[PDB]
Every structure is written in C-alpha cells, then in structure tokens.
Design a protein around this ligand. Sequence first.
Ligand SMILES: N#Cc1cccc(Cl)c1NC(=O)Cn1c2ccccc2c2ccccc21
Length: 476
Amino acid sequence: GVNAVHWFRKGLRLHDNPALKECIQGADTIRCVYILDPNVGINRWRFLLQCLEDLDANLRKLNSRLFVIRGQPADVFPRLFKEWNITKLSIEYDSEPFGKERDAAIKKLATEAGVEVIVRISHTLYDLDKIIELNGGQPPLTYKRFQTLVSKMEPLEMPADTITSDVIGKCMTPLSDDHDEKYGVPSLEELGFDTDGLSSAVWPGGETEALTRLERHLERKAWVANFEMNANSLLASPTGLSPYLRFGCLSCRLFYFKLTDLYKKVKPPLSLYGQLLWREFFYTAATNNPRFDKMEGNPICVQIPWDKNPEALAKWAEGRTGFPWIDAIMTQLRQEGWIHHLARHAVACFLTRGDLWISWEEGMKVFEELLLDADWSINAGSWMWLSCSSFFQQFFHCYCPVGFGRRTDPNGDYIRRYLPVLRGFPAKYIYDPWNAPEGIQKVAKCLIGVNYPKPMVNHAEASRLNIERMKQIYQQ
Ligand SMILES: N#Cc1cccc(Cl)c1NC(=O)Cn1c2ccccc2c2ccccc21
C-alpha cells in the first residue's frame, strides 16, 4: 500500500515534472498539495493564484484535484502524513538557501513518520552542486568560467513525459465532499487585497498560458525575428516567457529542447540560449550563500558605504523622482509587473552607484515585491552586478536618466503612456520637462514642481561625485 503526496512550490506544471512522475509510479493513491498561509504585491499574488487555478483545472481533467492547504509546512504536514497514511513525498529540488533550509526541516519530519522523500531537479537545466564540485567547492563568479564547467558536464537531461491519464494508470485521488471549501484555491480578497480598481492582468499566470506563449514564441523566433530595446520592446510582449520560467509554469528544459530543435530544422550559437544560462549562473552563485541578498556577511560582495535615505528611496520606488524616464519605468513596474531588462539597468543604476547612492539591497526588495520574474537568486545577483558590488563589475559608465530614455524612445511615447500628466509636452522636452519654458508648461497643463515634481538630484553632479567616491574605495 503506497500513498503518495506531491508538494508543489515552484514547478507549477504537469509537463516535465520528474518528481511528480516518479511519485506516481507504483503508488495506489496520489494527492498534489500547494501550501500557502493567508513582501509580495498584488500582481505577484494574482499570478500565483491564476497558476494554481490552472493546475487545479488540469488535474480535474485527470479525475484529480489540487489540494491548497492554508498554513505552514512544518505545522501542517505531520498530521497530514498521519491522516492520509502517507509513505512517499515528492518535491522538485529548490537550490535557494532559504528553501533548502525549509526542505531539510520537512525531510526530518518525513523521516520521523516513515515517509520516503523523492527529490528531483527540474527548475534548472543543470545539477548545480555538480558544477560547484567541478569548480573545487565554490561557484564560478564569471560567465565564461561557468560555460567552461558546463562543457564538462554530462549532456543535458531531456524533459520528462507530461502527466496524463495513461501515466496515472490505476493510481487515483481520494476526494472528499468538502474538497472545494476545505482545500480550494484562495481569492485575492481572501488574502486581504482590495480588488476595486483592478484591470485584468497583462501577464496571465499558468501552465496553459505558458505553453501557448511558448509555441507562438518559437514561431516568432524563426519566422519573424530569424534568430536575431526600442520603443516597441519596452511594452509587454504577448510571447514573453520570463514570469512563467520563474514560477515554473514553463520548464526551462522543455524551452531549451524546443529552441535547439527549432534551430536544427530551420537552419547552434550560445546566443540562442543566452538568457537560460544566465539563469543557471545566478542560481549556482546563490545556492551555498545564505547571505547572497545582503552586503554585510556576504563574502562575494564588496563593502560599499551606501547612504540611508528613506525619502529618496520612497521617491524612487513610487516613481516620483522628477526624471520622467525613471518614473515611467517604475510606474509600468508597479502597474503591470514586468519591465524590460535594460529598463531594470537604468533604474538600478539610478538608485545605487549612478545617482542616489542607496544600497542595492533596498532596490532588490522593491523588485522582489513588484517584479513577476524576480526570483531571489537572479534578483540579488543582478542588483550586485548593476551596483558594481560583485562579479568583478567596474564603474565604467553611468546611465543618463535623460539620454538613455531619449535614445530608446526618441518620441517619448513611453513617457506619455505611463505618466499621462506629461502627455502635453513636446518630444524636445518630454525627458527633461524642467527645461520647458513656462509657456510650454502652460499649454501642456502641467506646472513642473506643482503637477509633476522637479528632478530630485542634479544628475551631472551627483554622478560625478558618485564615480569619484566609488573610485577611491579601491587602491588607485
Ligand atoms: N539575465 C541576466 C543578467 C546577466 C548579467 C547581468 C545582469 Cl544585471 C543580468 N540581469 C538583467 O539583465 C536584468 N535584471 C535586472 C537588472 C537590474 C536589477 C535587477 C534585475 C533582474 C531581476 C530578475 C531578472 C532579471 C533582472
């Protein structure tokens, strides 16, 4: 008699799920559980709930259900193991340090109850511990070294077979009459969110949406882009995949295999999988470093004397800096949950080494709240990279908070879109409205300093001083 539980955390999908697949074989019963207890904003929570709704719908097609349990894993699992006579628990492996800690605690609870624990890798292409072992026990802090080590790995695992009725076979899911009340997927309102002024999501969550986008994304790559940021790129794309990769609606391995297959048929260079390998790079760097998201106590982070300035930080996080390019980017972020990678560079440089001299830790927390694709490893890694705090990054140049926006969207339509208060300004002044004469401000029906703030710093001087201060941290 084998009674199994598969615990969803990431990997919110039925395709390429080796842990769920392995759990199901030889089992008599199976139940898939998600555990949630009622720094995450409404867009991230809405995405998660839509993922869980899609999972429950797809399990329903298999004569099963998703079980959503409200609580803490260490508090709910002991009695669950007992009630359901559980003998096997499966999880997709979590390389991140806090998830490792949580999973080690559950493993000991499982052992005490005589429960076998199955762990399989499917959030990353590679076994990250084997990369670290290859490198002598420390992760590589350069991309080229990472590539070299990966080229000595065994060829990659192919994705596992989707969970179907055939896979499930004679295994089944016992279902109680009270299932939809006791184990049902929560609502935003039940989590405490006012959904009064809530437009529908720019980024619908779920495996079904992810796989649809994946197909269209490949057609676009071959047919339209031919495998090769402008005003268009700043706006969300219907074939963008990154929030689905972060939540695990889309397998990174399935994506990788589909990309290689598409290229083979139609026509590979590393640029074909550039994005996916940077993902593995930061996970690898983070896995053995519990202070990866901190400056102090973080052995890979340069110690830099950042300022504490809650007023400036709040202006940055709420898009009230008086620099329209920065404010529009931070507005799209809060409203929609995604901004272009190069827009992230711009606002991150502004907050840290370029202008405000505020610690990268603070920007990382705002991004963790608002960015759908901001998993902990890549977010902390990127903020250290941008602030010149690790990965041997140097302060060569500083993004201009006027000129970069002006070069990406010369017309300023992006500004007019997210900062409609500035819609009346001509392109000559749209990125530096404080330089507009009062008469232009009067026709635009926007008095700078009254209806839209004046710039919070002088960029030419703040950047000059900042570059100086960073230079002198190092021996000249
Ligand atoms: N990929 C990659 C990569 C590779 C090398 C260097 C950097 Cl900074 C990289 N990050 C980006 O380009 C964009 N990016 C950011 C930029 C600034 C701050 C946070 C983020 C962030 C968070 C989650 C996901 C992508 C993110």
